[PDB]
């Protein structure tokens, strides 16, 4: 199982970024996918959930209305549109096959 | 250990003629050897209690499980995995008897134990979440319900196969929650998802050649034991929607798969 995060960077409060997550070694379209984060001195936190399709999406209370999870099953990529950014969101972002990042990659750094 | 596996084997076949005496006798034999307050007595009691439950002897089942719980707390510790297992059996028993309020703390205690011991991402922790969520759902406490079901589904998908029966079980349970709430479209999605990975297991990725029963159902309209229920569910939903040609398709496909919701508890 391979999961590679990208799409991070530095932005100003209210700014936007899009996280990408390339997958291989498993039937991606047969899995639900999860987005997690980790602030410096804090513990790993669940951010978003997406079904095998796009019909069922879930978000952490704080990111609701600002973040949007999507996926391209043909490209085997997961996405997280991060609009109207706040410094609370400034953390390390990982994609996983569950909450608390199982099979997570090296992640992507998100600065506000 | 062998004796336990044989009792489990007859109980699987529903052959309770053999299952019960053997159990009663092992219990008798074990009490003589080590007394009543012993882990092995609790093991045989737990097995027997589950045979009684399948026979719809709910009062007798509740008694044995409490007796078995008492022993395990006494001999193994208050926060032992075996204790969690017995609580999960009582909670399931109360829930299937509609005593959801009584079941709820048992289920929560088991969950706290299971997390501590097995780790927060163990399939047994997931099993428990599914029972807690379904127990809370029956009390209208939908707030946490959707969260627990998704946490459990996450565990069962990463730690187990995406074609593991628990994945489809948890999905039907969350679909039932959506149904209670009036979220018919969100439930329709989960039924379709279950039926898609089921088809793709038999005849690969969905293209214009290999389309699932529901795509054929929607076409007609315009013009595993965990899957047979999903077929009865989506068939019931299409019927609820007034989409009768699509309903009949799945209803006939359910009868074929066998040779409205059902609360799937995981033990």
Residue numbers in the entry:
A (entry chain N): 2 to 113
B (entry chain A): 214 to 436, 460 to 495, 704 to 711
Kindly provide excerpts from the paper associated with this entry.
At the molecular level, kinesin-1 is a tetramer consisting of two ATP-dependent motor-bearing heavy chains (KHCs) and two light chains (KLCs) that in mammalian cells are encoded by three (Kif5A-C) and four (KLC1-4) closely related genes, respectively, with distinct cell and tissue expression profiles. Regulatory KLCs interact with KHCs using their N-terminal coiled-coil (CC) region that precedes an unstructured region followed by a cargo-anchoring tetratricopeptide repeat domain (TPR) and a disordered C-terminal region that varies considerably between isoforms. While vesicular cargoes interact with adaptors that can bind to multiple sites on both KHCs and KLCs, diversity of recognition is often mediated by the interaction of the KLCTPR domain with short disordered peptide sequences on the adaptors. Using a structural approach we show here how kinesin-1 selects adaptors, like JIP1, that rely on an alternative 'Y-acidic' (tyrosine-acidic) motif for recognition.
The most C-terminal region of JIP1 (sequence YTCPTEDIYLE, JIP1C-term) has been shown to be necessary and sufficient for kinesin-1 binding and, in contrast to W-acidic sequences, JIP1C-term has a strong preference for the KLC1 isoform, rather than KLC2. We therefore fused JIP1C-term downstream of KLC1TPR via a flexible (TGS)10 linker. Nb-mediated crystallization dramatically improved crystal quality and allowed us to collect X-ray data for the complex to 2.7 Å resolution using synchrotron radiation. For JIP1C-term, electron density is observed for the last eight residues of the 11-aa long peptide whilst for TorsinAC-term we could model all but the first residue of the 12-aa long peptide. The cavity stabilizing the side-chain of (p0)Y709, located between TPR3(α5/α6) and TPR4(α7), is lined by V305, K309, Y313, N344, L347, L348, N351 with the amide group of the latter residue participating in a H-bond with (p−2)D707(Oδ2). Two asparagine pairs (N386/N343 and N301/N344) also engage in hydrogen bonds the main chain atoms of (p−1)I708 and (p+1)L710, respectively, while the C-terminal glutamate (E711) at position (p+2) is locked in place by salt bridges with residues R266 and K340 that interact with its side-chain and main-chain carboxylate groups, respectively. The latter interaction is critically important as FP measurement using a C-terminally amidated version of the TAMRA-JIP1C-term peptide (TAMRA-JIP1amidated C-term) shows complete abrogation of KLC1TPR binding. A structural superposition between KLC1TPR-JIP1C-term and KLC2extTPR allows to rationalize the minimal impact that the LFP-acidic extension has on JIP1C-term binding.
